[PDB]
Design a binder for this molecule. Structure first.
Ligand SMILES: Nc1ncnc2c1ncn2[C@@H]1O[C@H](COP(=O)(O)OP(=O)(O)O)[C@@H](O)[C@H]1O
Ligand SMILES: [Mg+2]
Lengths: 471, 578, 155
């Protein structure tokens, strides 16, 4: 329709909720406009409708509202976002309004922000290897195009720097796969939820220096912005990413700054509505709500585009069993976990290899894709590093002077591994250099102890000395 | 039938008024779009409906229509080589009616009404028919699909159709009472299909994994549970069981998990080979898919549909294996609905009746004599996803008290890339003593003795590890260091298995028996050598260790020569020490 | 005999019936629907306006229009006899071995009266269980309560 209808008779305002009685004409999930007595207009959404009264959650703060003059008017029945190809290079707030001073976009379509589930028949397996330039990711936790790979961080760990480095250095290798094509760079969709100025300025300066702002769409919700707007931002960011990737064949990389703030914003609404909580007070439906965000990535059969997600989240008191990391690990296809101990020693990036995992690693590596010895080298490195870490605990009891000759080899291997393979700085290693370093690290062990590697590769790559690379 | 109007909408729950006369658990049509619903509470003139589709955009006042029947599934030919959602709708035809996304209000039939099947009658006019008897035979992907009388239909045959090609809607047999029997029938998903008699379990369910087949066996009609934290190996193990097991028909239920896991099954299975028939592997598999971002209320329906289909294939004389990808998501969905019902919760917010549902789901398995006199079996393997790996969860504890086998996974073993990462200390099996008469006749006469010796060695190694943590490994005597090193060899050779390797992914029983015999022979020779005076540092450098340690990758057809060479090499190596 | 048809609420395992103040607390009732199937139930609360009944089995076929409730017995009772030696029961007194039901000498309430502490006497005689680790070291005396603690996979 083209008319407008206003509902008066608000009977309850408290916190983020608002009740209106005679609003039975409002559809469930609709978007409404709340008009103040001074003319200010605020947004809202219906979360429960009945013939007795309707419940509306308010995005902005409730200061200045009164029960005598406030009125509620309908905007649209289903929350929709106007998208276009021209929003590349623009900046928007948490609810989609421009904040760069340019005039508003002209839509080509209006798409629901909640999205729709992808048909499992229409999906296809992600198999394209992506070279990030980090040895601990490229070799042992390989990332493929179309994967959801979050980063598990801490309070003082440099997760933002790692994400910026990955976005700067990411590329595919068509020469290894035999295609011979030259690709085009990823389009970036950046969604910030409760971000601070200290990190936002760093991200802006990094994107300005790398020149990636002309290919980027930014959704910013700052720390002093209203909390309830964080419900919408991931949905609109993923709607734009899906539209671009599956209508214009772009390769889209999506970064979400902090899902912990999103979970707190969800817990506020859940506690306001007296929902049955899960563990640590979070609402019981948080798994489904987190699933409606993560599973919007992947690849689609018969289409060139793709969506890749790199969420970032902070672990409270570095606890892996906290509900947010627990459900994120249950939903996503792996994780990258940073270590505080490696950070204290000065190692950058401080990626801990043992708790990290990549589920789609087997699809994108092997013969004809990267190299024939990738997986076995990764397995041998994992086993040897685990043995060295185990010996580190025996040393604290019996002393390192009482060790056998065999265990000292594992201890020195662990030390050299930490000091050379993980620690790389800002340099951009290729996959071949990372494999060369890995083979140079495996050469310090006896040839008969490489149980997980076939003799064919051992006879071809073993024997290279680490001083030949760094000397 | 009863009609009403919508009174209140809140998420997945809809309250309708004017619903006097409606019955519990009937299927309703909600709104102008005709969304599928189910009544779960009656209160005066109002009824409480949960919706199996997304409820965004609905308005108060839309009509609600009750069908007067519970949730049911169509059972007949054409179910193999297909994928269904939580309420049995084919996804391959939703893929045609809609684009790459799944939308609301799509009405498709479970069985294709256009395809024609070669009908061959087996009954004659004047014959007495009864529930569970066969009416005819229809070929399907190398099987022989048998048309069955519905379980509660009795009468006498008036006329039958001659041999020919008909659709599933064609009435082939007409009874004297006027009831027509088609090629399919409908059955409520919450009623267990009746049988004649239950039987004891005496035949093993071969999985292809050494540790599960040898140490913790499960019988053909048994049940098992595999709990563990995220990243421990539950899905890979279940898919390996789907690939390599000796079941005739495999039913897979993806209750609330990732969609890429179902995509992998849809893509790779048509290229694999059925082990016992030689055809494509997907021709024996039925998939039920309800991913994480699908509507919440359909998770229970997927489980019930899967178990009902598995029982339907049981009645034809097949042995069916049913895999449930996660039974914890079912409990979470129950908790989410219980939140919308404002009822009193249990220990961790779950409804109090959760254990009754879990017990009723698991007790549908077993080996039976069907109503037609044939023999069938259904075995259920269900995964559990505890929050944060806490095994004291109510769902984990409820499952522990009804299953026959328990395969606990460990995160510490998965961290160091040791797979299948089964925790030997916390796992058990109750079918071990009943399968011995099968093992003695089909594998070897001394196989249970070898298995018990291996278990004793593992127990002794587990006993010594408390001292190794206390005073270090070097303080032990050589006779105990031998036990420690043999335990390490067993752990790194026999128990470890790679599911993605070209050869190691599948292992027959005789190969595992040969490996166990080689390990025990080496241990006996080493124990004899220590008392003679040889230091242990001499023994564990013999080249026969590499012969033992790489026997995993020897192919099945080449193993008998390798075994006979290694057994001679053991004696050749151990006589030259002292 | 008498049937109550004032059902007003059904949800899960509970149902409410109005004008049922004649039902004693803890009584056993039979629930009948339009299809003729009969289910069991127990009264868990009695009031002036309605009574609350916990339903055995499942409540799939019930509806507020045709459901009726009738009384079976006010107190849960079991018929006892010496014919019971060699019989099997389903947990509520119904035979499942296929033999005809026994004829009761008496009917007793299943909840028992406490023993008078001045009526007991000290246990003084043992029971031979045939297991050496129980007979020799942990002897079982007539009148003792000796539980067995086990794990999960233990026999
Ligand atoms: N038998 C095995 N052989 C080799 N790798 C395995 C095996 N089992 C599990 N894995 C590895 O462990 C990971 C576990 O992933 P998955 O089983 O999908 O998740 P979850 O167990 O949390 O459902 C997989 O990515 C796989 O690479
Ligand atoms: Mg899984």
């Amino acid at each position: 329709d083209l008319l407008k209808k206003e509902y008066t008779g608000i009977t309850y305002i408290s916190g983020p909720l608002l009740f209106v009685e005679n609003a039975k004409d409002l559809a469930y999930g609709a978007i409404v406009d709340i008009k103040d007595g001074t003319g200010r207009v605020r947004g809202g959404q219906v979360i429960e409708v009945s013939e007795e009264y309707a419940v509306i959650q308010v995005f902005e703060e409730t200061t200045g509202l009164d029960l005598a003059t406030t009125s509620v008017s309908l905007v649209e029945d289903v929350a929709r976002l106007g998208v276009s190809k021209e929003m590349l290079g623009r900046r928007f707030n948490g609810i989609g309004k421009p904040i760069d001073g340019l005039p508003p976009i002209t839509p080509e379509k209006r798409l629901p922000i909640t999205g729709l589930p992808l048909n499992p028949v229409a999906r296809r397996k992600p198999e394209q290897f992506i070279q990030t330039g980090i040895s601990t990711i490229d070799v042992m936790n390989t990332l493929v195009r179309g994967q959801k790979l979050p980063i598990f961080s801490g309070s003082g760990l440099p997760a933002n720097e790692i994400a910026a480095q990955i976005a700067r250095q990411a590329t595919v290798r068509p020469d290894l796969s035999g295609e011979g094509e030259k690709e085009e760079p990823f389009a970036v969709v950046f969604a910030a939820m409760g971000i601070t100025q200290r990190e936002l300025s760093y991200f802006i300066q990094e994107f300005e220096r790398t020149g990636a702002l002309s290919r980027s769409v930014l959704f910013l919700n700052k720390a002093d912005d209203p909390t309830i707007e964080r419900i919408l931002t991931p949905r609109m960011a993923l709607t734009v990413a899906e539209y671009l990737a599956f209508e214009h064949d772009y390769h889209v990389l999506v970064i979400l700054t902090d899902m912990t703030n999103y979970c707190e914003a969800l817990r506020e609404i859940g506690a306001a509505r007296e929902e049955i909580p899960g563990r640590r007070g979070y609402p019981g439906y948080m798994y489904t709500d987190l699933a409606t965000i993560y599973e919007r990535a992947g690849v689609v059969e018969g289409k060139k585009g793709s969506v890749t997600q790199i969420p970032i989240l902070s672990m409270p008191d570095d606890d892996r069993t906290h509900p947010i990391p627990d459900l994120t690990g249950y939903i996503t296809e792996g994780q990258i976990q940073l270590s505080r101990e490696l950070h204290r020693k000065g190692i950058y990036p401080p990626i801990d290899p043992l708790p990290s995992l990549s589920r789609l690693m087997n699809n994108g590596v092997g013969k004809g894709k990267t190299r024939e010895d990738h997986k076995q080298v990764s397995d041998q490195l994992y086993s040897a590093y685990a043995n060295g870490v185990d010996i580190r605990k025996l040393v604290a009891i019996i002393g390192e002077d009482a060790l056998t000759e065999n265990d000292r080899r594992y201890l020195q291997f662990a030390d050299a591994f930490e000091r050379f393979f993980i620690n790389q700085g800002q340099q951009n290693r290729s996959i071949e250099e990372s494999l060369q370093i890995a083979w140079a690290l495996l050469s310090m062990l006896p040839q008969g102890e490489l149980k997980r590697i076939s003799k064919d590769h051992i006879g071809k790559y073993y024997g290279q000395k680490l001083e030949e690379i760094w000397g | 039938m009863i009609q009403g109007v919508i009174q209140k909408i809140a998420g997945p729950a809809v309250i309708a008024k004017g619903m006097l006369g409606a019955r519990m658990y009937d299927i309703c049509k909600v709104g102008e779009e005709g969304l599928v619903g189910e009544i779960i509470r009656l209160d005066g003139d109002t009824a409480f409906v949960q919706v199996y589709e997304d409820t965004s955009g609905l308005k108060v006042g839309e009509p609600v229509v009750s069908t007067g029947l519970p949730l049911a599934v169509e059972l007949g030919p054409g179910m193999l080589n297909g994928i269904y959602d939580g309420i049995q709708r084919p996804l391959e035809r939703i893929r045609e009616k809609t684009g790459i996304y799944i939308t609301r209000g799509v009405v498709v039939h479970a069985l294709d009404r256009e395809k024609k099947w070669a009908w061959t009658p087996m009954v004659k006019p004047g014959d007495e028919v009864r529930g569970g008897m066969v009416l005819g035979t229809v070929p399907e992907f190398g099987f022989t699909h048998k048309i069955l009388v519905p379980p509660d239909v009795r009468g006498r045959v008036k006329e039958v159709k001659p041999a020919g090609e008909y659709t599933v809607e064609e009435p082939v047999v007409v009874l004297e009472d006027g009831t027509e029997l088609k090629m399919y029938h409908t059955w409520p998903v919450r009623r267990a299909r009746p049988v004649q008699r239950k039987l004891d379990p005496n035949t093993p369910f071969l999985t292809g994994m050494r540790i599960l087949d040898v140490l913790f066996p499960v019988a053909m009609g048994g049940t098992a549970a595999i709990p563990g934290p995220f990243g421990s190996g539950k899905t890979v193990t279940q898919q390996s069981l789907a690939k390599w097991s000796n079941a005739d028909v495999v039913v897979y239920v993806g209750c609330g998990e990732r969609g890429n896991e179902m995509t992998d099954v849809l893509v790779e299975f048509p290229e694999l080979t059925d082990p016992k028939t030689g055809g494509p592997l997907m021709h024996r598999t039925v998939l039920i898919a309800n991913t994480s971002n699908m509507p919440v209320a359909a998770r229970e329906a997927s489980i019930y549909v899967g178990v009902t289909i598995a029982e339907y294939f049981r009645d034809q004389g097949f042995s069916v294996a049913l895999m449930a990808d996660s039974t914890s998501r079912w409990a979470e969905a129950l908790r989410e609905i219980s939140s919308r019902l404002e009822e009193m919760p249990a220990e961790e917010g779950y409804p109090p009746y959760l254990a009754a549902r879990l017990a009723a789901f698991y007790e549908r398995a077993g080996k039976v004599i069907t109503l037609g006199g044939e023999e069938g079996a259904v075995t259920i393997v269900g995964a559990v996803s505890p929050p944060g790996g806490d095994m004291s969860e109510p769902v984990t504890q409820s499952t522990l008290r009804i299953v026959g086998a328990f395969w606990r996974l460990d995160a510490s073993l998965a961290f160091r890339r040791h797979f299948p990462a089964i925790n030997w200390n916390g796992s058990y099996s109750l079918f071990t003593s009943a399968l011995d008469p099968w093992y003695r006749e089909n594998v070897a006469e001394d196989y249970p003795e070898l298995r018990d010796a291996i278990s004793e060695l593992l127990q002794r190694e587990a006993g010594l590890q408390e001292i190794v943590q206390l005073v270090g490994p070097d303080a032990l005597q050589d006779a105990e260091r031998l036990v420690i090193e043999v335990g390490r060899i067993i752990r790194e050779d026999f128990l470890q298995q790679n599911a993605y390797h070209e050869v190691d992914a599948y292992c027959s029983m005789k190969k595992a028996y040969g490996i166990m015999k080689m390990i025990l022979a080496f241990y006996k020779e080493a124990e004899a050598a220590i008392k003679r005076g040889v230091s242990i540092d001499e023994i564990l450098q013999l080249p026969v260790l590499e012969r033992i340690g790489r026997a995993r990758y020897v192919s099945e057809e080449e193993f008998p020569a390798y075994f006979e060479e290694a057994m001679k090499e053991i004696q050749g190596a151990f006589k030259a020490l002292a």
